[PDB]
Amino acid sequence: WTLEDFDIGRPLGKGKFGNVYLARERQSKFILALKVLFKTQLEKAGVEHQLRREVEIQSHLRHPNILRLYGYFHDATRVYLILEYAPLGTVYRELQKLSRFDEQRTATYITELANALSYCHSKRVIHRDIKPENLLLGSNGELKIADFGWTTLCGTLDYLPPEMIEGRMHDEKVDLWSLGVLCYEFLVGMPPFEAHTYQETYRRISRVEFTFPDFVTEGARDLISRLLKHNASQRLTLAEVLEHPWIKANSS
Amino acid sequence: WTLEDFDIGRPLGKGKFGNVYLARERQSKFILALKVLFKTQLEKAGVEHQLRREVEIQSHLRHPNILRLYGYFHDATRVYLILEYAPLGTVYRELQKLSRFDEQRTATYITELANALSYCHSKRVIHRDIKPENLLLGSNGELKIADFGWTTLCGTLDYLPPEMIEGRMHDEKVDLWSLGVLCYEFLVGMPPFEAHTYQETYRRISRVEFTFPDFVTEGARDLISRLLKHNASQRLTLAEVLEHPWIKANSS
Numbered sequence: 001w002t003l004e005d006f007d008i009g010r011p012l013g014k015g016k017f018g019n020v021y022l023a024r025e026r027q028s029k030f031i032l033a034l035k036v037l038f039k040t041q042l043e044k045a046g047v048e049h050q051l052r053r054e055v056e057i058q059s060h061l062r063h064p065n066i067l068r069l070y071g072y073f074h075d076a077t078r079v080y081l082i083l084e085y086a087p088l089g090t091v092y093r094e095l096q097k098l099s100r101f102d103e104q105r106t107a108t109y110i111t112e113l114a115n116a117l118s119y120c121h122s123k124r125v126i127h128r129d130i131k132p133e134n135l136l137l138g139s140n141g142e143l144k145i146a147d148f149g150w151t152t153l154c155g156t157l158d159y160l161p162p163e164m165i166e167g168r169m170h171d172e173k174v175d176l177w178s179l180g181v182l183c184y185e186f187l188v189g190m191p192p193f194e195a196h197t198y199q200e201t202y203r204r205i206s207r208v209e210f211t212f213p214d215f216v217t218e219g220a221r222d223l224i225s226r227l228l229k230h231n232a233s234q235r236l237t238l239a240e241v242l243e244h245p246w247i248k249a250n251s252s
Numbered sequence: 253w254t255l256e257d258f259d260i261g262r263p264l265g266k267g268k269f270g271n272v273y274l275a276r277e278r279q280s281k282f283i284l285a286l287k288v289l290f291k292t293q294l295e296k297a298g299v300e301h302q303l304r305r306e307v308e309i310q311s312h313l314r315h316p317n318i319l320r321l322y323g324y325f326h327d328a329t330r331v332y333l334i335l336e337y338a339p340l341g342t343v344y345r346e347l348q349k350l351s352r353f354d355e356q357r358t359a360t361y362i363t364e365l366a367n368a369l370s371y372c373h374s375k376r377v378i379h380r381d382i383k384p385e386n387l388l389l390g391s392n393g394e395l396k397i398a399d400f401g402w403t404t405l406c407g408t409l410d411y412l413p414p415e416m417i418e419g420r421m422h423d424e425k426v427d428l429w430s431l432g433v434l435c436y437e438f439l440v441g442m443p444p445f446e447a448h449t450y451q452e453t454y455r456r457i458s459r460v461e462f463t464f465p466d467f468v469t470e471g472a473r474d475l476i477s478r479l480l481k482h483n484a485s486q487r488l489t490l491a492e493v494l495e496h497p498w499i500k501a502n503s504s
């Protein structure tokens with residue numbers, strides 16, 4: 001592929017995903033999204049080799065709940081990612097529209113998330129920040145993970161390994177917590193620990209301090225509570241999420 | 253123990269370790285360090301329960317290369333940690349004094365670090381930020397770990413689990429990298445990826461880009477290079493560090 005193979009259209013995502021444009025392959029008329037990375041920025045971050053490893057892996061994967069990387073190319077000053085276009089926008093936008101999701105829509109999204117996250121773990125696909133703004137919606141309204149772009153909270157910079165500075169610390173156990181947070185936010189309309197200040201949000205997470213509105217049913221409460229465990233080893237596994245009674249009863 | 257059991261002396265560590273004072277137990281005249289934590293701060297951080305778990309574990313441990321927690325107590329507004337006093341200051345101060353350490357001193361410190369870190373892993377002791385400022389020196393010049401006090405580099409706050417916000421992500425593999433960085437800094441006088449800007453330091457870590465001065469011997473180069481692996485699973489284990497030829501040849 002070359003730049004000249006594409007007509008470049010309107011920018012996508014208001015810069016939240018970097019320089020991304022709606023695009024069309026000129027000969028086939030196929031609609032896709034093209035992400036433009038500047039080599040000077042990649043070089044200054046030291047991420048060229050890590051990016052190569054990741055896109056190599058992604059370009060060989062297919063899964064209905066992971067945003068697809070069709071391929072990639074480069075020129076003298078840029079690297080170009082050829083991405084699946086998700087026509088229905090982000091889950092964030094949908095939640096903004098509806099205020100909150102019903103039990104069917106939520107259980108279906110959680111199944112799809114669990115399936116995507118399982119597949120990422122088995123195929124060693126790095127993902128970085130699971131939240132509604134990073135979740136896209138396909139033609140049939142199926143959820144697609146898109147969280148691939150990239151003193152500290154991990155300690156002092158000079159002493160930190162590449163996996164910390166490259167955002168590669170979301171392992172299976174971390175993801176279980178994320179899934180609990182997402183299940184709550186889908187049903188309620190806001191994540192469980194949200195507060196006006198960062199300090200207060202910090203406090204609430206550490207204390208695992210949250211409340212369920214009355215409209216949240218017993219089954220949904222059981223799921224969420226079993227995911228949001230302070231002790232990582234105690235969290236309900238992805239396999240166990242897929243077999244949870246509430247998930248079985250409600251997922252499309 | 254109660255506050256009235258202690259004479260409180262000069263502040264220690266210039267606030268880098270919080271409110272810490274040289275102290276003496278009044279009846280025995282024993283010299284120690286007393287750390288004062290304000291309950292209002294603990295409450296606002298949401299760390300009361302996590303602190304309890306950690307000090308409970310620590311107060312039952314003894315190891316020559318881990319700073320000892322003798323015990324703890326509280327009153328209406330404060331929690332007090334009764335700590336071992338390390339009379340010879342920090343490894344940072346010593347490195348500042350000498351500019352760099354010889355192979356004997358370095359190998360001995362690395363053995364001691366490896367032993368401390370191994371013991372922490374086996375007894376499930378959390379430690380948070382391995383660097384020379386957090387390493388203290390005992391009466392006989394033995395090294396003692398003291399790194400126990402506490403958009404982000406890990407992602408978006410509302411979606412992060414307690415282990416990320418509580419600084420509990422330094423596992424065995426992370427520690428291997430830290431040990432490589434420390435070995436280099438002991439021998440050279442600065443950590444391998446140090447740069448004027450955070451961005452340039454970031455770049456150097458991700459690229460694993462560093463150079464050895466001429467005075468660094470083949471054996472030390474082999475050790476350091478085998479620890480500083482981009483791929484976490486490839487790093488030399490703590491057991492393998494203790495059996496490395498350079499360590500065997502040089503450690504006191």
Ligand SMILES: COc1ccc(C(=O)Nc2ccccc2)cc1NC(=O)CCSc1ncnc(N)c1Br
Pocket residue numbers: 012013017020033035037047051054058067068069081083084085086087089136146148149150
């Ligand atoms: C497989 O998707 C990716 C794969 C990789 C990377 C990436 O940047 N990797 C990376 C880049 C530099 C350094 C380190 C990692 C990014 C994405 N994805 C994206 O950036 C999403 C673009 S927004 C969008 N896309 C389609 N349809 C929509 N409606 C929207 Br809105």
Ligand SMILES: COc1ccc(C(=O)Nc2ccccc2)cc1NC(=O)CCSc1ncnc(N)c1Br
Pocket residue numbers: 264265269272285287289299303306310319320321333335336337338339341388398400401402
């Ligand atoms: C076993 O050592 C600790 C155990 C625990 C904590 C701690 O704060 N935990 C904690 C507090 C709040 C929230 C979460 C964790 C801190 C330390 N240690 C320290 O603070 C070191 C004090 S400086 C010093 N000490 C002795 N001799 C010297 N020459 C110096 Br200088």
